[PDB]
Amino acid sequence: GNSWLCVRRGGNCRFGRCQFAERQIGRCSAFQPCCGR
Numbered sequence: 001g002n003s004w005l006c007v008r009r010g011g012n013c014r015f016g017r018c019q020f021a022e023r024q025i026g027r028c029s030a031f032q033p034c035c036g037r
Contacts, residue, residue, distance in 0.1 A: 001026040006034030 005014050006028050012018075013028035018035035026034035 001028065001034060003028035003032070003034070009034075009036070011036045 006013060006026050009025070011025050011034045013032040016031060016033075017034060018024055020037075021030050022035050022037040024033045025036035028034050
């Protein structure tokens with residue numbers, strides 16, 4: 001997806017994966033998932 005959409009939702013784009021206490025809501029880039037925290 002688009003990184004800004006995720007960031008503007010309030011999510012963060014992390015490297016590779018995110019924490020288990022957080023969830024992947026999409027993908028900002030190939031190696032950066034949109035993580036909803």
